[PDB]
Amino acid sequence: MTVDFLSMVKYTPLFISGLIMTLKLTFLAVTIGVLMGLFIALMKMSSIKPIKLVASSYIEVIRGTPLLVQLLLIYNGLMQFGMNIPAFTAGVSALAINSSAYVAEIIRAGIQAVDPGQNEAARSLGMTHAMAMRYVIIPQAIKNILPALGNEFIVMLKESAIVSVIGFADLTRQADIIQSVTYRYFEPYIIIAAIYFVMTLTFSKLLSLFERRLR
Amino acid sequence: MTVDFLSMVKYTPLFISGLIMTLKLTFLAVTIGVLMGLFIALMKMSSIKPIKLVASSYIEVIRGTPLLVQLLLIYNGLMQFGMNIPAFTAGVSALAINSSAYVAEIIRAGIQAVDPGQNEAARSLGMTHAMAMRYVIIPQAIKNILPALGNEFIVMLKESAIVSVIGFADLTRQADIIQSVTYRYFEPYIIIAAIYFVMTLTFSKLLSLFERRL
Amino acid sequence: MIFVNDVYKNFGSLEVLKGVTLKVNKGEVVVIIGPSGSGKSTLLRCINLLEEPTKGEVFIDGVKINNGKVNINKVRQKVGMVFQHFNLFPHLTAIENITLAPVKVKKMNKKEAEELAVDLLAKVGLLDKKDQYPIKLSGGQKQRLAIARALAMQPEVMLFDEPTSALDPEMVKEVLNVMKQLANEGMTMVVVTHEMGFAREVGDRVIFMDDGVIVEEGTPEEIFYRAKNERTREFLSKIL
Amino acid sequence: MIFVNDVYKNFGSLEVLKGVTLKVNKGEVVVIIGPSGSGKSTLLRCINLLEEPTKGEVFIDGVKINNGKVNINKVRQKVGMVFQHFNLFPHLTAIENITLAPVKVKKMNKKEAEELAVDLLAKVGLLDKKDQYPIKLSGGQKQRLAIARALAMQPEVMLFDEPTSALDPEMVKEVLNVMKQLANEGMTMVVVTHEMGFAREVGDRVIFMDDGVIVEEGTPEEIFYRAKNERTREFLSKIL
């Protein structure tokens, strides 16, 4: 019919239920994506030809290819092998894989951002690469990295809204559900968007506060 | 059944049609997003603060909010007002708007990347802010910006695959179309991805080639 | 002509100038020295208002300029400024660098703009770099060109904010020579520097600054050979 | 002790060392000078293999070390290095800076480490600051601490890559005094510098490098008063 937001009020538990789900998808994906990424990074640092090969083509392939196609390739592309994974594990796997790549080169970029002089002083004092790495370089890369991880989580919040098109009940799905019972799209979406906005603000400034308590 | 790619071969015209459709979706979006973005940027530089906060809240809202939801606001949320825009204009408007914000703060960031000394030298020689901007700072900010606009086009290519969920016949929808006649999802998706990848590489290296001519 | 009157400056809670006064009359060469963080450069930059004092006032030719009731683009027309890191315009040729400000600010004819430029280039010895871009110049060449450019707007006082300190040592003397030449031609100059040889050979006055204050001032000989404050003697003992 | 033999180095098509030979015996203070782009710092960094020669060979104690048939950490254990921009470890306190390499490389006892560290801090006059972090150090304090750290690994030769070039002038001489004291105690030293006073006061040898070549060498007095080559005279006339 026409605009009415107060109608929307007693769908409040839906929006909230959406919000929560968006968080627990995002955490989980990023979490795996971090660990995966960490490990992916370590592969690229090996001097073994095949492993550097495949870690770098994994990274280039995932970053150079849309998130949507990866989600659908996990979901739809795996039916015909007589495997049907839930919407949730599908979305999680897609996001954690994608995030794993972007984390892998967050870490690589955080390392070459520590001044090459540090490594030079370390080596010049007789330390081997391993020791230079443990006692000197990595403790600094870590404080290059944590802010970029925070920023990554913040981007993943927005990105995860894409699991709705697969029928996962995240915060964006709520507009479908509500509209099926109100015939209204505009209002519940405006509300949903504003929820995304507020989340993004919140995490953006606890990330900037964390940055001025770190570095 | 199980894996078979040669099956896929004379569905080639579909993919291409998707590919082509993706590019002209992306071009047009970025282009509009550029002119819009440029103009948005000027609003943020005015000292009339109604205009400036209208721009700053626009930008902050769009970048802090998913592209998918903006697409759905243009397509679905605007039906109940008796408006039905095609999937295509829905997508272009969404993308160009989104791109307009990200371009707005590419431009601001390219200006503030000009060494503050250039402006100082300009003012200390008697040039007004306007002249400093025209003859000294902007000619340099531009060559900060173009590498980020190019990269924006490259990211928008990947991003534009989301108008498939609205039923636009881009490179990603082709997997739906093909599966409807082959019952195959995996294979046309791998081919779709590898097409996106080849696009990303091509533009990334003729743009990195462009970045190092300046 | 120049009168910085009891100014203060803060950056946050960092107090850089703590009540400083400077008068400069036509023809003087004033050379300011002191340890890093004494506030020298901040004092110099208050003169043409690249900083604005937290308090106190800056007068040029008897006219107050930090009251916001004055056109600053015609103050900096009279008060030239040369920078530690050159600040040359990279997209412009040598002459173009020089002629830009006269053409767009003085509304000069472009062909007398370019003859003024070629005479300045000749003057500072950059004539065969007439059409070459900054990247292709050495530090000494760069600073000499920055000086030519400053001069094309024909100022009545020239401010030098440590003009040689970002130069390889092999490059210092040629820039210093130009400065010396300017001083000998009667140019009014305020120079912040680490090169005491310059203050000796051409300074009329030397100001010693420390912890945001002028602690002692006098002639070159007074300060370098007969200084009575011992903060002056200590600093001088470390750098001479 | 040190024998750099006819080395060359390239970075891309840019030729930095074009056939250089350098011999250093125990106890010498050798000071290398020259215009920027001469190759001073590159030749200095060949000695402990922070660069690798495109051709030529580097011998330390009669042992070729750029054949890849030798352990480089064992070399740099004996060959110290002090850096233009200090390269202090920012997350470690003063002591911790000094004791890191000895504890983890030489496997020293940690309180024998901490007594070595506190007497080195006393030596360079930083004992009052054992526990501070580098950020709360001045340039002079920083370079003096980098020297303490270098010495804690007890090398037989010390390499100095323009150690005062990034210091405020009031701060150069405290670092210079420490280095001089090392020279007076018989340390083998290769120093690349803009400070000729040092070569005067404690230098045994002066190497003048220009465009990737050693163009002239001799004692300090020979070079500063009686230089025979014309490039040497040009350079010195610009820098003396």
For residue A181, the domain's CATH number is 1.10.3720.10
Chain D hits for A118, Cβ within 8 Å: 87, 89
d(CA D105, CA D77): 9
Q: Whole domain around residue A145: which residue ranges?
A: 1-215
Q: Give the nearest partner residue to A185 out of B76, B162, B200, using CB atoms.
A: B76
Between chain A and chain B, the number of residue pairs with CB atoms below 8 A apart is 129
User: In this structure, what DSSP letter does residue D63 have?
Assistant: E
B173 to chain A, any CB pair closer than 8 A? The answer is no
Closest CA to C158 of C115, C201, C187, C181: C187
Chains within contact range of chain B (3+ C-beta pairs < 8 Å): A, C
Between chain C and chain D, the number of residue pairs with CB atoms below 8 A apart is 27
Across the interface, whether the CB atoms of D239 and C36 are under 8 A apart is answered no
Across the interface, whether the CB atoms of B120 and C87 are under 8 A apart is answered yes
User: Where exactly are the structural domains of chain C?
Assistant: 1-240
Count CB neighbours of D135 within 10 A: 8
Instruction: Name which of B118, B119, B120, B125 to mutate to probe chain C: the one with the most chain C Cβ atoms within 10 A of its Cβ.
Output: B125
The 3-state DSSP composition of chain B as helix, strand, coil percent (nearest 5) reads 80, 0, 20
Structure tokens, A109: 């970029």
d(CA D22, CA C188): 51
Beta pairing partners, C161: C192
d(CA C125, CA C173): 13
Chain C hits for B123, Cβ within 8 Å: 50, 72-73, 76
Method: X-ray
Question: Mapped to the 3 state alphabet, what secondary structure does chain D carry?
Answer: CEEEEEEEEEECCEEEEEEEEEEECCCCEEEEECCCCCCHHHHHHHCCCCCCCCEEEEEECCEECCCCCCCHHHHHHHEEEECCCCCCCCCCCHHHHHHHHHHHHCCCCHHHHHHHHHHHHHHCCCHHHCCCCHHHCCHHHHHHHHHHHHHHCCCCEEEEECCCCCCCHHHHHHHHHHHHHHHHCCCEEEEECCCHHHHHHHCCEEEEEECCEEEEEECHHHHHHHCCCHHHHHHHHHHC
Chains C and D touch (3+ CB pairs under 8 A): yes
Chain centroid, CA D99 distance in Å:
20
Across the interface, whether the CB atoms of A76 and B204 are under 8 A apart is answered no
Chain D hits for A214, Cβ within 8 Å: none
What radius of gyration, in Å, describes the C-alpha atoms of chain D?
18
Q: How far is D34 from chain C (nearest CA, A)?
A: 9
Beta pairing partners, C60: C2, C63
Chain A hits for B200, Cβ within 8 Å: 64-65
Q: Give the nearest partner residue to C87 out of B118, B126, B127, using CB atoms.
A: B118
Across the interface, whether the CB atoms of B125 and C91 are under 8 A apart is answered no
Chain B hits for A205, Cβ within 8 Å: none
d(CA B111, CA B143): 10
Q: Are C199 and C33 in contact (CB under 8 A)?
A: yes
d(CA D183, CA D160): 12
Chain C hits for B127, Cβ within 8 Å: 73, 101, 104-105
Residue with tokens 């054949």: D67
Q: Give the nearest partner residue to A69 out of B66, B76, B193, using CB atoms.
A: B193
Pairing of strands D213-218, D205-210: antiparallel
Q: Are D157 and D79 in contact (CB under 8 A)?
A: yes
Residues in chain A, how many? 215
d(CA B197, CA B175): 16
Across the interface, whether the CB atoms of B126 and C77 are under 8 A apart is answered yes
A-contacting residues of D 91-130, CB under 8 Å? 91, 100-101, 104-106
Question: Could you give the dihedral angle defined by the CA atoms of residues C38, C44, C46 and C48, in that order, rounded to the nearest 10 degrees?
Answer: -170
Residue with tokens 């849309």: A66
**Single-letter amino acid code for the residue at B98:** N
Chain B hits for C100, Cβ within 8 Å: 125, 135-136
The helix (run of H) or strand (run of E) holding residue D144 is helix D139-152
Q: How far is A167 from chain B (nearest CA, A)?
A: 12
Q: Give the nearest partner residue to B135 out of C85, C90, C100, using CB atoms.
A: C100
C231 to chain D, any CB pair closer than 8 A? The answer is no
Chain A hits for B78, Cβ within 8 Å: 185-186
User: In this structure, what DSSP letter does residue A89 have?
Assistant: H
Across the interface, whether the CB atoms of D91 and A125 are under 8 A apart is answered no
Closest CA to B76 of A175, A177, A169, A12: A175
Q: Are C116 and C152 in contact (CB under 8 A)?
A: yes
Beta pairing partners, C8: C18, C55
Domains held by chain A: number: 1
Reduce the DSSP state of residue C215 to 3 states and report it: strand
Spatial strand order of the sheet with C55-60 comes to C14-24, C2-11, C55-60, C63-64
d(CA A144, CA A114): 8
**Single-letter amino acid code for the residue at A47:** S
Chain A hits for D81, Cβ within 8 Å: 121, 124
Across the interface, whether the CB atoms of C101 and B126 are under 8 A apart is answered yes
Closest CA to D163 of D90, D86, D88: D86
User: In this structure, what DSSP letter does residue A163 have?
Assistant: G
Instruction: Name which of C36, C41, C168, C170 to mutate to probe chain D: the one with the most chain D Cβ atoms within 10 A of its Cβ.
Output: C170
D90 to chain A, any CB pair closer than 8 A? The answer is yes
Q: How far is A128 from chain D (nearest CA, A)?
A: 7
D169 to chain C, any CB pair closer than 8 A? The answer is yes
Domain C1-240: CATH architecture, name and number where available: 3-Layer(aba) Sandwich (3.40)
d(CA D170, CA D240): 20
Structure tokens, D68: 């890849």
**Could you tell me which residues of C are annotated as the binding site for Mg(2+)?**
41, 162
d(CA C145, CA C157): 18
Evaluate the CA torsion angle D194, D200, D205, D209 in order and state its sign. Answer: positive
Closest CA to A175 of A6, A8, A27, A1: A8
Closest CA to D187 of D158, D164, D159: D158
- Resolution for this model in angstroms, one decimal place? 2.8
Q: Are B71 and B55 in contact (CB under 8 A)?
A: no
d(CA C125, CA C119): 10
Evaluate the CA torsion angle D23, D25, D28, D29 in order and state its sign. Answer: positive
Reduce the DSSP state of residue D32 to 3 states and report it: strand
